[PDB]
Amino acid sequence: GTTYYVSSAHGDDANAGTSENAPWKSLTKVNDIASDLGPGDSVLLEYGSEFNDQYLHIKDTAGNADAPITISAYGDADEGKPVIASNGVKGSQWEQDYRANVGNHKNKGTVSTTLLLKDVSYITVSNLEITNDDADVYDPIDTWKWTDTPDSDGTKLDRSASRMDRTGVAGIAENGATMSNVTLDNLYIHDVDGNIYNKHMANGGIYFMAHYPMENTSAETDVWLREHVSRFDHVTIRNSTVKDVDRWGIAVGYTAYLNYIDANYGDGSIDDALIAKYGSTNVRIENNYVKGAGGDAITLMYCDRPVIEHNVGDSVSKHINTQDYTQPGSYGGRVAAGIWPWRCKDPVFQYNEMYNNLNAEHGNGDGQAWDADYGDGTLYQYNYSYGNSFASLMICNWYAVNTTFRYNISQNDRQGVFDLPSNGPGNHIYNNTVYVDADSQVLTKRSNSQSLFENNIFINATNTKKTETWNRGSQNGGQTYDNNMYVNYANKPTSDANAIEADDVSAVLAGAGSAPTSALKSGAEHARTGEKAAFDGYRPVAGSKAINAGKVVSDLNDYAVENDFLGNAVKGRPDLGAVEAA
Ligand SMILES: CC(=O)N[C@@H]1[C@@H](O[C@@H]2O[C@H](CO)[C@H](O)[C@H](O)[C@H]2O)[C@@H](O)[C@@H](CO)O[C@H]1O
Ligand SMILES: [Ca+2]
Ligand SMILES: [Ca+2]
């Protein structure tokens, strides 16, 4: 196929694209033929290019497995990624309509979008910087702090509830058919000043969503919509930084087809066929950095077996507070968690890091790193949480079930490591190493529900043998413990007749508490091995009453144990906590 070229300083729209010598000036000419691309076609923007009050929309087209369509950059990276900056002009705006009720949320209206991919399959977007900046909204995360008075620091927000929604990248399936093999690589999406409140408009750094193509008006429409489903397959977002956005950081899969998925909640478990038909399959979220979202960092919605891995979340829920979240209406949502799933089936979050989820002190009713929310089979394993304002993990309400949370490290997470408010049964916390300071404890004050702790290292990182509340409530069999190491505590649970008490954390681990306090400047995950390994602190020491003292464990939700936090194999007698020792 063909390849067109663009340069904001050269080009001249009266050119021809096709060759690097002869490019276009603006994206006007690219909008014009986007919809006629094109398996093996490509469009490329020269590093250093700055396209203001501009946008790229692209509708109803495809490559194929042989050859994707490709949107990207060309020649001498050390120039600046090419910047697309819509500034939410009229031309970026389109009319979003789920064409179905999807909860107490705005589900229809005008949305500004810098890069829209509306039913485009077999495409790959690359090495692009994307803004959707209001000049009249300024509140950067790098400099953010809590103030007695709103906007008293040279910052300014539009707290209007009817503020227009804005996306960096929106991905939209509304033809009653699969959108597939879409790929976002690199991308620096930042300063996307959307609506502070709206959870399910295309409002945030990157949002992928599905709509009914028609509103469901009759028996005959219902017959049709059951079998013709807008949905995603083989979506992959990776190596990207989403920073300073409102509201969501990265969201994929919210679908009008939840009117089918959530038809029979009861018991809480999610049928495979149902999620595969109506939901979104082969979703990968990979090696990204989310910093300073207004709300949640990363979320997978209505996804069949997604893979969320090697991502870094940092300092989100920036606008989830009483100063900024002033006009919630009847919608609520003054509430956010870090990296989590919503009505997914057997997802896997792994090798991720989550720092400093904000404002649980200032009106964020959540504030956790992780949230096994409604849905089934959630898997968190090999994740590090640090310094979050309210817990490492929540397991949320009646229809959150069958969670496994394992070989993870919580460090200085605050107001309790484990939040269990009325969650459903089947959850298994095991083999995690939790460092619990004087701002925290093991369980949140509001916990009252099921979990089964086994093979964990619970560490009292205060200056006194603590008498802890290990049990609040008895909903779905309350919290039961067996085979856990308790360090520097004055007690244990009345329900762990196989306890392993220890007295000093220095005789148990190499250097507890010394894991990182902030994401790396880059946004990358921390090294776990080699010169720069930043988790060595949590390796047991020669002679730890933690070596070989875990019982072999029958993961309640049929998940095969495989390796520890650091990834070395776990065979034989499992070493207590999340690390094994060479
Ligand atoms: C059960 C519950 O209320 N859970 C909260 C989550 O809320 C749901 O979020 C989904 C998002 O797809 C949708 O908006 C639904 O209508 C909401 O109830 C969510 O807010 C989560 C993260 O902060 O917290 C839970 O308390
Ligand atoms: Ca701005
Ligand atoms: Ca402020």
Coordinates of C-alpha atoms in Angstrom, one line a residue, residues 25-437:
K25 CA 1.4 20.8 6.3
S26 CA -1.7 20.1 8.4
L27 CA -3.9 17.1 9.2
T28 CA -6.9 18.5 7.1
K29 CA -5.7 16.4 4.2
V30 CA -5.3 13.3 6.4
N31 CA -8.9 13.5 7.8
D32 CA -10.0 13.7 4.2
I33 CA -8.7 10.2 3.3
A34 CA -8.4 8.5 6.7
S35 CA -11.6 6.6 5.9
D36 CA -10.2 5.3 2.6
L37 CA -7.1 3.7 4.3
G38 CA -6.1 0.8 3.6
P39 CA -4.4 -2.5 4.5
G40 CA -0.6 -1.7 4.5
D41 CA -1.3 2.0 4.2
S42 CA 0.5 4.4 6.6
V43 CA 0.6 8.1 7.7
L44 CA 3.6 9.5 9.3
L45 CA 4.3 12.9 11.0
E46 CA 7.9 14.2 11.2
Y47 CA 9.4 14.4 14.7
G48 CA 9.3 18.1 15.7
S49 CA 5.9 18.7 14.1
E50 CA 3.4 20.8 16.1
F51 CA -0.2 20.6 14.8
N52 CA -2.3 23.1 16.8
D53 CA -6.1 23.4 16.9
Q54 CA -5.9 20.0 15.0
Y55 CA -7.1 16.4 15.4
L56 CA -7.2 13.0 13.6
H57 CA -10.6 11.2 13.4
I58 CA -10.6 8.1 11.2
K59 CA -13.9 6.0 10.7
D60 CA -15.2 2.7 9.4
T61 CA -12.2 1.1 8.0
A62 CA -9.5 -1.6 8.5
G63 CA -6.2 -3.2 7.6
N64 CA -5.9 -6.9 7.9
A65 CA -3.5 -9.4 9.6
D66 CA -1.0 -9.1 6.7
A67 CA -0.7 -5.4 6.9
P68 CA -2.0 -3.0 9.5
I69 CA -2.8 0.6 8.7
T70 CA -0.2 2.7 10.6
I71 CA -0.3 6.1 12.1
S72 CA 3.1 7.2 13.4
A73 CA 6.3 9.3 13.0
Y74 CA 9.4 9.4 10.8
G75 CA 13.1 10.4 10.9
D76 CA 15.3 11.7 13.9
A77 CA 13.5 11.1 17.2
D78 CA 15.7 13.6 19.1
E79 CA 13.4 16.3 17.7
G80 CA 10.3 16.0 19.9
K81 CA 7.6 13.5 19.2
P82 CA 5.1 15.1 16.8
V83 CA 2.4 17.0 18.9
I84 CA -1.3 16.9 18.0
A85 CA -3.0 19.6 20.1
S86 CA -6.8 19.9 19.4
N87 CA -7.4 22.4 22.2
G88 CA -10.9 21.1 22.0
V89 CA -11.9 23.0 18.8
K90 CA -15.2 22.3 17.2
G91 CA -13.6 20.0 14.6
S92 CA -12.4 17.6 17.2
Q93 CA -15.9 17.3 18.6
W94 CA -18.4 14.5 17.9
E95 CA -21.7 13.2 19.2
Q96 CA -21.3 10.3 21.7
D97 CA -24.4 8.2 22.4
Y98 CA -24.4 4.8 24.0
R99 CA -28.1 4.4 22.7
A100 CA -28.9 2.5 25.9
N101 CA -29.0 3.2 29.7
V102 CA -25.6 2.3 31.2
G103 CA -26.2 3.4 34.8
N104 CA -26.5 6.7 36.6
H105 CA -24.0 8.5 34.4
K106 CA -24.1 11.0 31.5
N107 CA -24.3 8.6 28.5
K108 CA -24.7 11.0 25.6
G109 CA -23.4 14.4 24.5
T110 CA -20.7 16.3 22.7
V111 CA -17.2 15.0 23.2
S112 CA -13.9 16.6 22.0
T113 CA -11.4 14.1 20.9
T114 CA -7.8 14.6 19.7
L115 CA -7.5 11.1 18.1
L116 CA -10.7 9.2 17.5
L117 CA -10.7 5.6 16.2
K118 CA -14.3 4.9 15.4
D119 CA -14.8 1.3 14.2
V120 CA -11.3 1.1 12.8
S121 CA -9.8 -2.4 12.9
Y122 CA -6.1 -3.6 12.2
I123 CA -4.5 -0.2 13.0
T124 CA -1.4 0.9 15.0
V125 CA -0.7 4.3 16.4
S126 CA 2.8 5.2 17.4
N127 CA 5.3 7.7 18.7
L128 CA 2.8 10.6 18.9
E129 CA 2.2 13.2 21.6
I130 CA -1.4 14.1 22.2
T131 CA -3.0 17.1 24.1
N132 CA -6.6 18.3 24.5
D133 CA -5.7 21.3 26.6
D134 CA -7.9 24.1 28.0
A135 CA -5.7 27.1 28.5
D136 CA -8.1 28.2 31.2
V137 CA -7.7 25.0 33.2
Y138 CA -4.2 24.5 34.8
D139 CA -3.5 22.2 37.8
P140 CA -0.3 20.1 37.2
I141 CA 0.4 17.0 39.2
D142 CA 4.1 17.5 39.5
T143 CA 3.4 20.6 41.7
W144 CA 0.0 19.5 43.2
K145 CA -0.6 19.9 47.0
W146 CA -3.6 20.2 49.2
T147 CA -4.6 23.8 50.1
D148 CA -6.9 25.4 52.6
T149 CA -8.5 27.4 49.8
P150 CA -9.4 26.1 46.4
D151 CA -7.2 27.3 43.4
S152 CA -5.0 29.4 45.7
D153 CA -1.7 28.3 44.2
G154 CA -1.8 29.8 40.6
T155 CA -4.0 26.9 39.6
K156 CA -7.5 27.0 38.1
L157 CA -10.3 24.5 37.5
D158 CA -13.6 24.4 35.8
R159 CA -15.8 22.6 38.3
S160 CA -18.8 22.9 36.1
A161 CA -20.8 19.6 35.9
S162 CA -21.8 20.3 32.3
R163 CA -18.3 21.0 31.2
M164 CA -17.6 19.3 27.9
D165 CA -16.0 15.9 28.0
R166 CA -12.5 15.5 26.4
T167 CA -10.4 12.5 25.3
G168 CA -6.8 12.2 24.2
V169 CA -7.5 8.9 22.4
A170 CA -11.1 7.6 22.1
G171 CA -11.8 4.1 20.6
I172 CA -15.4 3.6 19.6
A173 CA -17.3 0.5 18.4
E174 CA -21.0 1.5 17.4
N175 CA -21.7 -0.6 14.3
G176 CA -22.9 -3.8 16.1
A177 CA -19.7 -5.5 15.2
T178 CA -16.2 -6.3 16.6
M179 CA -13.5 -3.7 16.3
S180 CA -10.2 -5.6 16.5
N181 CA -6.4 -5.6 16.4
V182 CA -5.9 -1.9 17.5
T183 CA -2.6 -1.0 19.0
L184 CA -1.4 2.1 20.8
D185 CA 2.4 2.3 21.2
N186 CA 4.4 5.0 22.8
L187 CA 2.0 8.0 23.0
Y188 CA 2.4 10.8 25.4
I189 CA -1.1 11.8 26.1
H190 CA -1.2 14.8 28.5
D191 CA -3.1 17.9 29.5
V192 CA -6.5 16.5 28.5
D193 CA -8.9 18.8 30.4
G194 CA -12.1 16.9 30.4
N195 CA -15.1 16.9 32.7
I196 CA -14.2 16.3 36.4
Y197 CA -17.1 14.0 37.1
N198 CA -18.2 11.9 34.1
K199 CA -17.1 8.3 34.4
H200 CA -18.4 7.0 31.1
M201 CA -18.1 9.6 28.5
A202 CA -15.0 9.4 26.4
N203 CA -13.5 11.7 29.0
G204 CA -9.8 11.1 29.9
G205 CA -6.4 10.3 28.4
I206 CA -7.5 7.1 26.6
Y207 CA -11.0 5.6 26.6
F208 CA -12.3 2.7 24.5
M209 CA -16.1 2.0 24.7
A210 CA -18.9 0.3 22.8
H211 CA -22.4 1.5 21.9
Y212 CA -25.5 0.0 20.5
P213 CA -25.7 1.1 16.8
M214 CA -29.5 1.6 17.3
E215 CA -31.5 2.3 20.3
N216 CA -33.4 -0.9 21.4
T217 CA -37.0 -0.1 20.6
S218 CA -38.8 -3.5 20.0
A219 CA -38.6 -7.3 20.2
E220 CA -37.1 -7.4 16.7
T221 CA -34.3 -4.9 17.7
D222 CA -33.6 -7.0 20.8
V223 CA -33.3 -10.1 18.7
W224 CA -30.8 -8.2 16.5
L225 CA -28.7 -6.6 19.2
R226 CA -28.2 -10.0 21.1
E227 CA -26.3 -11.3 18.0
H228 CA -24.7 -8.2 16.5
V229 CA -22.4 -6.8 19.2
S230 CA -20.2 -3.7 19.3
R231 CA -17.1 -4.9 21.2
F232 CA -13.3 -5.0 21.1
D233 CA -10.8 -7.7 20.3
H234 CA -7.0 -7.6 20.4
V235 CA -6.6 -4.2 21.8
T236 CA -3.1 -3.4 23.1
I237 CA -2.1 -0.2 24.7
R238 CA 1.6 0.0 25.8
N239 CA 4.7 2.1 26.5
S240 CA 2.6 5.2 26.9
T241 CA 2.5 8.0 29.5
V242 CA -0.9 9.4 30.4
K243 CA -0.4 12.5 32.6
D244 CA -2.5 15.5 33.8
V245 CA -6.0 14.4 32.5
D246 CA -9.6 14.6 33.5
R247 CA -11.3 12.3 34.3
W248 CA -10.1 8.7 33.6
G249 CA -6.4 7.8 32.9
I250 CA -7.0 4.6 30.8
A251 CA -10.3 2.9 30.4
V252 CA -11.2 0.0 28.1
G253 CA -14.5 -1.9 27.6
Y254 CA -17.5 -0.1 29.0
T255 CA -20.2 -1.3 26.7
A256 CA -23.9 -0.7 26.1
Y257 CA -24.0 -4.5 26.0
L258 CA -24.0 -4.5 29.7
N259 CA -27.8 -4.6 29.5
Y260 CA -27.1 -8.2 28.6
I261 CA -24.1 -8.9 30.7
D262 CA -25.6 -7.6 34.0
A263 CA -29.0 -9.0 33.3
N264 CA -28.7 -11.7 36.0
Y265 CA -26.2 -10.7 38.6
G266 CA -27.2 -13.2 41.2
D267 CA -24.4 -15.2 43.0
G268 CA -21.9 -12.8 41.3
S269 CA -20.0 -15.2 39.0
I270 CA -19.8 -14.4 35.3
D271 CA -20.5 -17.0 32.6
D272 CA -17.6 -17.4 30.0
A273 CA -19.8 -17.5 27.0
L274 CA -21.6 -14.3 28.0
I275 CA -18.5 -12.3 28.6
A276 CA -16.9 -13.6 25.3
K277 CA -19.9 -12.7 23.2
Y278 CA -20.9 -9.4 24.8
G279 CA -17.6 -8.2 26.2
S280 CA -14.1 -7.4 24.9
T281 CA -11.4 -10.1 24.4
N282 CA -7.6 -10.2 24.2
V283 CA -7.2 -6.8 25.8
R284 CA -3.6 -6.0 26.9
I285 CA -2.5 -3.0 28.9
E286 CA 1.3 -3.0 29.1
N287 CA 4.3 -1.0 30.3
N288 CA 2.4 2.3 30.6
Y289 CA 2.7 5.2 33.1
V290 CA -0.4 6.9 34.5
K291 CA 0.3 10.0 36.6
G292 CA -2.1 12.6 37.9
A293 CA -5.4 11.5 36.4
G294 CA -8.3 13.4 37.9
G295 CA -9.9 10.1 38.8
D296 CA -9.0 6.5 38.4
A297 CA -5.6 5.5 36.8
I298 CA -6.4 2.3 34.8
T299 CA -9.6 0.3 34.4
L300 CA -10.7 -2.8 32.5
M301 CA -14.5 -3.0 32.1
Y302 CA -16.5 -5.8 30.7
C303 CA -13.4 -7.6 29.6
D304 CA -12.9 -11.4 29.0
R305 CA -9.4 -12.4 30.4
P306 CA -7.5 -9.1 30.0
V307 CA -3.9 -8.8 30.8
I308 CA -2.7 -5.8 32.7
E309 CA 1.0 -5.9 33.3
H310 CA 4.3 -3.9 34.0
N311 CA 2.4 -0.6 34.4
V312 CA 3.1 2.2 36.8
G313 CA 0.2 4.2 38.3
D314 CA 1.1 7.3 40.4
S315 CA -0.7 10.2 42.2
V316 CA -4.3 9.8 40.8
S317 CA -7.7 10.8 42.2
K318 CA -6.2 14.4 42.0
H319 CA -9.7 15.9 41.5
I320 CA -11.5 13.4 43.8
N321 CA -12.0 15.7 46.8
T322 CA -14.3 18.2 48.4
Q323 CA -12.5 21.3 47.0
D324 CA -12.7 20.2 43.4
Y325 CA -15.6 17.6 43.1
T326 CA -18.2 20.2 43.9
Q327 CA -21.0 19.4 41.5
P328 CA -21.6 15.7 41.6
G329 CA -25.3 15.9 40.8
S330 CA -27.2 12.6 41.1
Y331 CA -24.2 10.7 39.7
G332 CA -21.8 10.5 42.7
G333 CA -18.4 9.0 41.7
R334 CA -16.5 11.1 44.3
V335 CA -14.6 8.0 44.5
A336 CA -11.5 6.4 42.8
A337 CA -9.1 3.5 42.9
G338 CA -5.8 3.0 41.0
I339 CA -5.4 -0.1 38.7
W340 CA -8.5 -2.4 38.8
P341 CA -11.2 -4.3 36.9
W342 CA -15.0 -3.9 36.6
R343 CA -17.2 -6.8 35.7
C344 CA -14.4 -8.6 34.1
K345 CA -13.8 -12.4 34.1
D346 CA -10.5 -13.9 35.3
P347 CA -8.4 -10.9 34.6
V348 CA -4.7 -10.7 35.5
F349 CA -3.0 -7.7 37.0
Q350 CA 0.8 -8.4 37.5
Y351 CA 4.2 -6.8 37.8
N352 CA 2.6 -3.4 38.3
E353 CA 3.4 -0.5 40.7
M354 CA 0.9 1.9 42.2
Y355 CA 2.0 5.0 44.2
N356 CA 0.2 7.6 46.2
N357 CA -3.5 7.3 45.2
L358 CA -4.8 10.6 46.6
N359 CA -7.4 12.4 48.8
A360 CA -8.9 9.8 51.0
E361 CA -8.1 12.4 53.6
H362 CA -10.1 15.0 51.6
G363 CA -13.3 13.2 50.4
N364 CA -12.2 10.3 48.2
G365 CA -14.4 7.5 49.6
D366 CA -11.9 5.0 48.2
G367 CA -8.2 5.7 47.6
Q368 CA -6.8 2.1 47.2
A369 CA -4.0 0.9 44.9
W370 CA -6.1 -2.2 43.8
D371 CA -9.8 -2.8 43.7
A372 CA -11.3 -6.3 43.0
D373 CA -14.5 -4.6 42.3
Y374 CA -17.7 -6.3 40.9
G375 CA -16.9 -9.2 38.7
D376 CA -15.3 -12.6 38.9
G377 CA -11.9 -14.2 39.2
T378 CA -9.8 -11.1 39.7
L379 CA -6.1 -11.9 39.8
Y380 CA -3.5 -9.5 41.4
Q381 CA 0.0 -11.0 41.6
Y382 CA 3.6 -9.6 41.8
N383 CA 2.4 -6.0 42.4
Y384 CA 4.0 -3.3 44.6
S385 CA 1.7 -0.7 46.3
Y386 CA 3.2 2.2 48.1
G387 CA 1.9 5.2 50.1
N388 CA -1.7 5.1 48.9
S389 CA -4.2 7.2 51.0
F390 CA -6.5 4.3 51.8
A391 CA -5.3 0.7 51.5
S392 CA -3.6 -1.6 49.1
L393 CA -6.6 -3.7 48.1
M394 CA -10.3 -3.4 48.2
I395 CA -12.7 -6.2 47.5
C396 CA -15.9 -4.3 46.8
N397 CA -19.4 -5.2 47.9
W398 CA -21.7 -8.2 47.2
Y399 CA -20.7 -9.1 43.6
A400 CA -16.9 -9.0 43.9
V401 CA -16.0 -12.7 44.2
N402 CA -13.3 -15.3 43.6
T403 CA -10.3 -13.0 44.0
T404 CA -6.8 -14.1 44.4
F405 CA -4.3 -11.5 45.7
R406 CA -0.9 -13.1 45.9
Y407 CA 2.9 -12.7 46.0
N408 CA 2.3 -8.9 46.2
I409 CA 4.1 -6.2 48.4
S410 CA 2.2 -3.4 50.2
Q411 CA 4.6 -0.8 51.8
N412 CA 3.4 2.2 53.9
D413 CA -0.2 1.9 52.5
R414 CA -2.4 3.9 54.9
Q415 CA -5.5 3.4 57.0
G416 CA -5.4 -0.4 56.6
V417 CA -3.9 -2.7 54.0
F418 CA -7.0 -4.7 53.3
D419 CA -10.4 -3.2 52.7
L420 CA -13.3 -5.8 52.8
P421 CA -16.7 -4.0 52.8
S422 CA -19.4 -6.6 52.3
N423 CA -17.5 -8.4 49.6
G424 CA -18.7 -11.8 48.3
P425 CA -17.1 -15.1 49.0
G426 CA -14.2 -17.1 47.5
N427 CA -11.3 -14.6 48.0
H428 CA -7.8 -15.8 48.8
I429 CA -5.1 -13.5 50.0
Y430 CA -1.9 -15.5 50.4
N431 CA 1.9 -15.2 50.2
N432 CA 1.9 -11.4 50.4
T433 CA 4.5 -9.3 52.3
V434 CA 2.7 -6.2 53.9
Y435 CA 4.7 -3.4 55.7
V436 CA 2.2 -1.8 58.1
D437 CA 3.2 1.6 59.6

